[PDB]
Amino acid sequence: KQIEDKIEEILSKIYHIENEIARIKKLIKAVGNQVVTTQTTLVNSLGGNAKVNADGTITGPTYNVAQGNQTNVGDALTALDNAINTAATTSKSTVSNGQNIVVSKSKNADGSDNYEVSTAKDLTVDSVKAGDTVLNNAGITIGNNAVVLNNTGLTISGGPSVTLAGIDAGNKTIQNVANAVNATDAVNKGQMKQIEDKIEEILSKIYHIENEIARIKKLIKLHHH
Amino acid sequence: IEDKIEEILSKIYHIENEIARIKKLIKAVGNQVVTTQTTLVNSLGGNAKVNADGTITGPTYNVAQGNQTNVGDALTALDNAINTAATTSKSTVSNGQNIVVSKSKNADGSDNYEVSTAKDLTVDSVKAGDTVLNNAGITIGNNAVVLNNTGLTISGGPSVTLAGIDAGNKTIQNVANAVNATDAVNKGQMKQIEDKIEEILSKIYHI
Amino acid sequence: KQIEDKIEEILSKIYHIENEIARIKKLIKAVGNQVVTTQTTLVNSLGGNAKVNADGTITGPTYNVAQGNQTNVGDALTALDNAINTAATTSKSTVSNGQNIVVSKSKNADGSDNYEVSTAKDLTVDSVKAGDTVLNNAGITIGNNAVVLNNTGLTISGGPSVTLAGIDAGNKTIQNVANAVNATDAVNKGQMKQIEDKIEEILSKIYHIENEIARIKK
């Protein structure tokens, strides 16, 4: 009969449709799972506190670079790029020369800069102190005014001086003076002693003359009698 | 015969319900896909976009004077840029003539260079006001007082040099009495002799 | 007849159902394609060796910046930020003044720092050598000890000296000495001439008298 075969056909087709449905359910389940896993990987790979919410929505990352906040990776990368350019600019310290100094700039091997600092060859200062010796506008001073060289000349504390006002021998002798030749040259003791000899000779001549005079007087007295 | 028909009808009813449920599930999964793609593109930035046709235009980044098509390449480029900038920005200081430089570490980790002079200076000249120190010696003022390799010279005044002593047409004061033959004599020592000659003249006059 | 009609009705329903199955399969396929576009784009955009596996899953990115290891973009960006801060701080060299030096900090036009180095106005040193002339604790020395100024005074090698011990004329004459005024002033040769003349005169006198006495004797 056509009826029984038609029922059989119908049941067969239903069986096949049910199997197809089972298959489709499996597919959809799998794809859903895959999608969920993709969302999770996205969130975990981005970081920035990204997370999948219960309502199916996804909160994106918020990054915190270069003293700001960015809602995506591109803005953050740009922020960092700028941060680097600025940091490279302001961190590059320089050196220059002032009074008495010479600064020579050159490249180090790695491309950074070196500044070699030297003094000038001629120094202009207020003073230079080296131990007990002081150099300033007034001149040279050694010790506690022990020896002074200034614009009037040389002065030694407790000793002689050679200044504009002339020569002070400091109540000590002046030694090793060669014999005076010119009228305005200093005479030494020997040159004076030379005259002293003549004085002695004169006094002897006078002595013997006096004795000869007394002899004469005595002879005159005897001649008178 | 009829019960079987009722059973088939119920079977078909249930199948129709299953189809409807399935369509809803597909729809939901599609929504999840859209959420994923849009979140992806929005989070990547760099002009990435999901296009109408379902295709996706990736991000393009522009860091370190280059263009990058992915996050990793950008991060790497930035890393290298940082390293290079760090290297070339770190300035150094060294010493030349008459200078000493001492390098130390600051608190924050940077370098400090302390610059001092050497303790012994080698120069061409040192000027302090009217006083000049140079190869020739010491010069004060416009050659008012000069100390050189010959000795001491005072302009319009006396001088003590290798050639000898020049009193500069002025008296030499505070000279102690000569003792040795080569010592200088003072006025008093002459006055004694003058007194002697005076006595001699009185002796002659009395004679 | 009602049975046969319910039968045909059922067959019609089944036909339409089969059609719905087919359509649903195509739709799921489309969704699959879109999922591929998604995972592929994710992996390609992250880099860091990210990869879509043939077996459906995804292997995430690994990053190696700032001498570290990062498994997400956030950590990488933070690492780079820290790297920038650190490098900015440590590359900023500073200069300070030591003995006899003055250092002045000011801003360059681009915001970096400049350090101007000068000497102090008053220097403390052990010595200054300027050619043949040396300044040190001992004093001033010129040449190979040719001329020396120390705490005892001035001494010229092979020449005169003005020192604590007094004035040494150096076996040379002292020239241009004005006539002595006070008792302790130096006398010049000229100041003796008069005296010398006197001596001579005296001699003359003596001589004459001597001879005249002889004339008296005879």
Cα-only R_g, chain C: 59
Pick among B78, B131, B177, B180 to test the C interface (most C CBs inside 10 A): B78
Rounded to whole angstroms, the Cα distance separating A140 from C136 reads 11
Q: Which two tokens stand for residue A71?
A: 């809602």
Whether residue B37 is found in the same domain as residue B17: yes
C-alpha separations of A80 from A45, A98, B102, B196, C71 in Å: 19, 38, 35, 110, 19
Rounded to whole angstroms, the Cα distance separating B65 from B85 reads 14
Q: Please answer yes or no on whether B164 and C177 come within 8 Å at the CB atom.
A: no
Q: Which chain C residues have a beta carbon less than 8 Å from that of A37?
A: 57-58
Whether residue C6 is found in the same domain as residue C85: yes
**For the domain that residue B155 is a member of, what is the CATH number?**
2.20.70.140
**For the domain that residue A60 is a member of, what is the CATH number?**
1.20.5
Whether residue C136 is found in the same domain as residue C213: no
Whether residue A41 is found in the same domain as residue A75: yes
Cα-only R_g, chain A: 61
Q: Which chain B residues have a beta carbon less than 8 Å from that of C78?
A: none
**Which residues on adjacent β-strands are paired with residue B139?**
B132, B146
Orientation angle between helical segments C190-217 and A189-224, nearest 10 degrees: 20
Question: Is B39 exposed, middle or buried (CB count within 10 Å of its CB: 0-12, 13-18, 19+)?
Answer: buried
Distance from CA of C34 to the nearest CA of A (A): 10
Rounded to whole angstroms, the Cα distance separating C122 from C71 reads 62
Which domain, by its residues, includes C64? Answer: 2-89
Rounded to whole angstroms, the Cα distance separating A48 from A59 reads 10
Q: How many CB pairs under 8 A join A and B?
A: 320
Q: Please answer yes or no on whether C24 and B23 come within 8 Å at the CB atom.
A: yes
Q: Please answer yes or no on whether C117 and A125 come within 8 Å at the CB atom.
A: no
Q: Please answer yes or no on whether C151 and A149 come within 8 Å at the CB atom.
A: no
Distance from CA of A177 to the nearest CA of C (A): 5
Q: Please answer yes or no on whether B11 and A7 come within 8 Å at the CB atom.
A: no
Instruction: Give the total number of structural domains in chain A.
Output: 4
Q: Please answer yes or no on whether B70 and C46 come within 8 Å at the CB atom.
A: yes
Rounded to whole angstroms, the Cα distance separating A84 from B65 reads 12
Cα-only R_g, chain B: 55
Structural domain includes residue B204 = no
Q: Please answer yes or no on whether C24 and B26 come within 8 Å at the CB atom.
A: yes
Touching subunits for chain A (3+ Cβ pairs under 8 A)? B, C
Q: Please answer yes or no on whether B99 and A108 come within 8 Å at the CB atom.
A: no
- Give the residue among A158, C55, C159, A219 at the shortest CA–CA distance from B153: C159
Strand B151-154 vs strand B145-148: parallel, antiparallel, or unpaired? antiparallel
Whether residue C6 is found in the same domain as residue C40: yes
Whether residue C200 is found in the same domain as residue C165: no
Coil vs helix vs strand at C166:
strand
Q: Please answer yes or no on whether B96 and A78 come within 8 Å at the CB atom.
A: no
CB C99, CB B97: distance < 8 Å? no
Q: HEC states along chain B? A: CHHHHHHHHHHHHHHHHHHHHHHHHHHHHHHHHHHHHHHHHHHHCCCCEECCCCCEECCCECCCCCCECCHHHHHHHHHHHHHHHHHHHCCEEEECCCEEEEEEECCCCCEEEEEEECCEEEECEEEECCEEEECCEEEECCCCEEEECCEEEECCCCEEECCEEEEEEECEEEECCCCCCCCECEHHHHHHHHHHHHHHHHHHHCC
Q: Find the length of chain C.
A: 218
Structural domain includes residue B26 = yes
Whether residue B13 is found in the same domain as residue B72: yes
Q: Which chain C residues have a beta carbon less than 8 Å from that of B138?
A: 133, 140
- Give the residue among A189, A97, A125, A147 at the shortest CA–CA distance from B175: A189
Q: What are phi and psi of B156, to 5 degrees?
A: 65, 25
Q: Please answer yes or no on whether B187 and C192 come within 8 Å at the CB atom.
A: no
Whether residue B79 is found in the same domain as residue B98: no
CB C117, CB C103: distance < 8 Å? yes
Whether residue B20 is found in the same domain as residue B64: yes
Residue in chain A nearest C1 by alpha carbon = A3
Q: Please answer yes or no on whether A61 and C73 come within 8 Å at the CB atom.
A: yes
- C200-204, Cβ contacts within 8 angstroms, sequence gap of 24 or more: C202/A202, C202/B197, C202/B200, C202/B201, C202/B204, C203/A202
Amino acid letter at B130? D
CB C178, CB B167: distance < 8 Å? yes
Q: Which chain B residues have a beta carbon less than 8 Å from that of A174?
A: 172, 175, 183-184
Q: How many CB pairs under 8 A join B and C?
A: 330
Strand A127-130 vs strand C122-124: parallel, antiparallel, or unpaired? parallel
Rounded to whole angstroms, the Cα distance separating A115 from A118 reads 10
Q: Which two tokens stand for residue A136?
A: 């300033």
Rounded to whole angstroms, the Cα distance separating C67 from C84 reads 13
Rounded to whole angstroms, the Cα distance separating A154 from C46 reads 88
Whether residue B109 is found in the same domain as residue B130: no
Coil vs helix vs strand at C215:
helix
Residue in chain A nearest B134 by alpha carbon = A122
Q: Which chain A residues have a beta carbon less than 8 Å from that of B40?
A: 42
Q: Which chain C residues have a beta carbon less than 8 Å from that of A180?
A: 173, 188-189
Distance from CA of C22 to the nearest CA of B (A): 11
Strand B131-134 vs strand A161-163: parallel, antiparallel, or unpaired? unpaired
Residue in chain C nearest A209 by alpha carbon = C210
Touching subunits for chain B (3+ Cβ pairs under 8 A)? A, C
The closest CB to that of B11, out of A14, A56, A116, belongs to A14
**For the domain that residue C165 is a member of, what is the CATH number?**
2.20.70
Q: HEC states along B94-105? A: EECCCEEEEEEE
Q: Which chain C residues have a beta carbon less than 8 Å from that of B110?
A: 89-94
Q: Please answer yes or no on whether C150 and A149 come within 8 Å at the CB atom.
A: no
Please give the full DSSP string across chain A, using - where no structure is assigned: -HHHHHHHHHHHHHHHHHHHHHHHHHHHHHHHHHHHHHHHHHHHHH-TT-EE-TTS-EE---B--TTS-BSSHHHHHHHHHHHHHHHHHHT--EEEE-TTEEEEEEE-TTS-EEEEEEE-SEEE-SEEEETTEEEETTEEEETTTTEEEETTEEEETTS-EEETTEEEEEEE-EEEEPPP-STTSBPBHHHHHHHHHHHHHHHHHHHHHHHHHHHHHHHHHHHH-
Residue in chain B nearest A101 by alpha carbon = B99
Q: Which two tokens stand for residue C215?
A: 């004339």
Token pair 């078909």 in the structure block, residue = B12
Coil vs helix vs strand at C41:
helix
Pick among A12, A117, A171, A175 to test the B interface (most B CBs inside 10 A): A117
> DSSP secondary-structure letter at C66?
T
Distance from CA of A184 to the nearest CA of C (A): 5
Distance from CA of C197 to the nearest CA of B (A): 11
C-alpha separations of C190 from A12, B42, C100, C178, C183 in Å: 164, 117, 57, 10, 16
CB A66, CB B63: distance < 8 Å? no
Q: Which chain B residues have a beta carbon less than 8 Å from that of A123?
A: 121, 123, 125-127
Q: Which of B74, B89, B104 is the last residue of a domain?
A: B89
Rounded to whole angstroms, the Cα distance separating A25 from A33 reads 12
Amino acid letter at C67? Q
Whether residue B18 is found in the same domain as residue B97: no
Structural domain includes residue B189 = no
CA-based angle A67:A71:A75, to the nearest 5?
Answer: 65
The closest CB to that of B85, out of A57, A61, A87, belongs to A87
Q: Please answer yes or no on whether C34 and B33 come within 8 Å at the CB atom.
A: yes
Give residue A89's Cα distance to chain centre: 23
Whether residue B26 is found in the same domain as residue B80: yes
Residue in chain C nearest A207 by alpha carbon = C206
Q: Please answer yes or no on whether C58 and A76 come within 8 Å at the CB atom.
A: no
The closest CB to that of B166, out of C130, C175, C186, belongs to C175
Touching subunits for chain C (3+ Cβ pairs under 8 A)? A, B
